[PDB]
């Protein structure tokens, strides 16, 4: 006779992410050639590496200004792609569409003061385990940090490590629960000479081993 089959139950319905194709209806169509079209990207993390975008500090500025005060803490923000400072970034705009991440996150610090104005800065990674971050560089000198002054080269890149218990981290902070699961990043002003209104621009890009893991679609539509 003919081949008998078993029309299984549970199989067949449409899943919107299934790995199979549809059947065609319009054959023998040729496209106009787009050989060597400029500006192609095949990975989002390539663009996220090569193109850093600005952070958003108080008053919505991409930079922190030196302060004529006793306070040496310029800015402080959670290590979270959902932080208030990263809300306007491309790394964050990409990371909102994924469940988990892992790897390095690079910060760039560009000094835009005059030539006759010097300064010395410091950035520290404060992993979780304390309730409140430190507000003195003398006390934050015991974390992982780096120092740098101003000169001919006006840029400085610091790489935030991925240190945690699990192999991956959520790209979204759960609820009003406090004390971010990852640490904080604290920028300090060690000293400065004749730098009253000079600024330091901050931006962020993805590291060498950064990775986003599980695609989702979380926005209200």
């Amino acid at each position, epitope marked *: 006779g003919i081949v008998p089959v078993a029309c299984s139950d549970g199989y067949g319905g449409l899943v919107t992410t299934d790995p199979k194709t549809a059947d065609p209806v319009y054959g023998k169509v040729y496209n106009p050639p787009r050989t060597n079209y400029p500006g192609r990207f095949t990975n989002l993390l390539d663009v996220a590496e090569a193109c850093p975008t600005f952070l958003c500090f108080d008053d919505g500025k991409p930079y922190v*200004v030196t*302060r*004529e*005060d*006793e*306070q040496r803490l310029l800015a402080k923000f959670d290590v979270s792609l959902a932080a208030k400072h990263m809300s306007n970034t491309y790394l964050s705009g990409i990371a909102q569409y994924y469940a988990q991440y892992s790897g390095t996150i690079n910060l760039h610090f560009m000094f835009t003061g005059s030539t006759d104005s010097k300064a010395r800065y410091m950035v520290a990674y404060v992993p979780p385990g304390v309730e409140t971050p430190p507000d003195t560089p003398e006390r934050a000198a015991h974390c992982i940090h780096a120092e740098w002054d101003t000169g001919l080269n006006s840029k400085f890149t610091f790489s935030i490590p991925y240190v945690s218990a699990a192999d991956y981290a959520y790209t979204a902070s759960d609820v009003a629960e406090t004390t971010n699961v990852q640490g904080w990043v604290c920028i300090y002003q060690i000293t400065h000479g004749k730098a*009253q*209104n000079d600024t330091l621009v901050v931006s962020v890009s993805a590291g060498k081993d950064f990775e986003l893991r599980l695609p989702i679609d979380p926005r209200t539509q």
Partner: nanobody
Amino acid sequence: QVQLQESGGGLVQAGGSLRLSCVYSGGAYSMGWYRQAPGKQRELVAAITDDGITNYRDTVKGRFTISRDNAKKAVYLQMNSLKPEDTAVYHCNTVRRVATLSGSSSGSWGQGTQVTVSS
């Protein structure tokens, strides 16, 4: 962080004048004068830089004059053409960004100056 004292306040009639002095001990940070109006929030009045530029609030502009003496480690506020509104406790301590006039809620204050203008 700093131990700083104030003096010079008191009582005076409308149209009088005063000279408030403050002496500090730490460094050469840009100082300024704050006042806490009765029942109102503490607000900055006039700020001075480290040996130079000064900046004043809109209301008190032109009637006040702030000055600094680095050697004696002192700051002065000369108040002229007083008005009944200017009665408050005039504190002094550091200030950040005298251009924008953004005060410092940093630490402890010394309550040493009380001005009472009459009318």
